[PDB]
């Protein structure tokens, strides 16, 4: 609406091509107490994640006899947003903690550890669009940093639509002012989707163009995750 999202030169507000990702930076083992940890930055969106466990889950009737229980928290610091965010969990945070947990549930080989919990705490230090996915990937990386067995790593990206153009990896302006916003996460080697949402509106053809563009970004991100994890042994 208010701002032009696709400029006359065909480029976006931040100068990117529609199939171009924001830059990515990843740190592992950033916390001393956590069993595993990571910081993931995608553009100016930055999360930190910490994993503890597996460890026996003390309210035992909440435990699972054949499985580890994943306990996940998506939280935004009050200074992560343009206007101060109240630290009390919001409905969004509650929904996103579930969506992220369920994404992790497909990856973590929880059946190794009957009666345990694996805690995953994620805090968003800077929110500039796509924090649920940055958060989820930080989680994947921290689980791996903790040596918790997993099917695959999780890479994800929001594709969307801006001034009628399918774009890859939205920024704030595009998130606030665009026509569509579609976070997708996968286990890329297993061709399995673990998180999938859309808000806004798209024709079915557009939805499919966008999904197709997500997979390209996701695989670029996956390769950066792999190399990030390998880095300290190289």
Partner 1 sequence: QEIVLQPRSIVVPGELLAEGEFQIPWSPYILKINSKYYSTVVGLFDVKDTQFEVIPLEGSFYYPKINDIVIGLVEDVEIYGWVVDIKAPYKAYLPASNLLGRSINVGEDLRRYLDVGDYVIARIENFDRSIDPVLSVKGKDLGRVSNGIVIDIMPVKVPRVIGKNKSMYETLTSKSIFVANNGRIWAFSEEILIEAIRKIENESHIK
Partner 2 sequence: GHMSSTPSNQNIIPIIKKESIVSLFEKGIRQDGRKLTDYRPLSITLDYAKKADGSALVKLGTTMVLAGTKLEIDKPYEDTPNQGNLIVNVELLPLAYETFEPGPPDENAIELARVVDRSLRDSKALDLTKLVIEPGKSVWTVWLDVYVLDYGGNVLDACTLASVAALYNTKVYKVEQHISVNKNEVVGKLPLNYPVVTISVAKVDKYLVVDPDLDEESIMDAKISFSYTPDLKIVGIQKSGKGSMSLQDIDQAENTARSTAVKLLEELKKHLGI
Task: By CB under 7 A, name the binding residues for RNA.
Answer: 45, 58-61, 81-83, 85, 90-92, 124, 127-132, 172, 175-176, 181, 199
Tell me the DSSP string of 10-64. Answer: S-BTTS--TT-PPPEEEEES--SSSSEEEEEEETTEEEEEEEEEEEE-SSGGGS-
Nearer to RNA, 58 or 232 (CB): 58
CA distances from residue 226 to 145, 153, 181, 231 in whole angstroms, order as listed:
12, 8, 26, 9
Residue 173 binding partner per list RNA, partner 2, partner 1, none, with a CB distance cut-off of 5 to 8 Å that depends on partner kind:
none
Which positions from 173 to 202 touch partner 2 by CB under 8 A, shown as an x/- string?
---------x----x--xxxxxxxxxxxxx
Which positions from 69 to 108 touch partner 2 by CB under 8 A, shown as an x/- string?
xxxxxxx-xxxxxxxx--xxx-xx-xx-xxxxxx--xx--
* Rounded least distance, CB 234 to partner 2, Å: 26
3 state SS of 85: coil
* Rounded least distance, CB 140 to partner 1, Å: 8
CA distances from residue 167 to 48, 195, 209 in whole angstroms, order as listed:
26, 19, 10
Nearer to partner 1, 71 or 85 (CB): 71
Please tell me whether residue 109 binds partner 2 under the rule CB under 8 A. no
Q: What's the longest Cα–Cα distance across the chain?
A: 61
């Amino acid at each position: 609406e208010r701002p032009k999202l696709i400029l006359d030169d065909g480029k976006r507000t931040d100068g990117r091509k529609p199939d171009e990702l924001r830059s990515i930076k990843i740190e592992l083992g950033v916390l001393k107490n956590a069993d595993g940890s990571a910081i993931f930055e995608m553009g100016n969106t930055k999360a930190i994640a910490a994993v503890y466990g597996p460890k026996e889950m003390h309210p035992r009737h909440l435990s699972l006899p054949d499985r580890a229980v994943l306990r996940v928290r998506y939280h935004m610091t009050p200074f992560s947003t343009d206007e101060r965010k109240n630290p009390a969990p919001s409905r969004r945070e509650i929904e996103l903690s579930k969506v992220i947990r369920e994404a992790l549930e497909s990856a973590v080989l929880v059946e190794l550890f009957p009666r345990t919990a694996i805690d995953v705490f994620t805090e968003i230090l800077q929110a500039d669009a796509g924090s649920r996915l940055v958060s989820l990937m930080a989680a994947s990386l921290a689980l791996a940093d903790a040596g918790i067995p997993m099917r695959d790593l999780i890479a994800g990206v929001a594709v969307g639509k801006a001034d009628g153009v399918i774009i890859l990896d939205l920024n704030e302006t595009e998130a606030m002012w665009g026509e569509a916003d579609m976070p997708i996460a996968m286990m890329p080697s297993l061709n399995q989707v673990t998180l999938f949402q859309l808000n806004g509106s798209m024709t079915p053809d557009e939805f499919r163009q966008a999904f197709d563009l997500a997979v390209k970004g996701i695989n670029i991100i996956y390769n950066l995750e792999r190399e990030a994890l390998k880095s300290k042994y190289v």
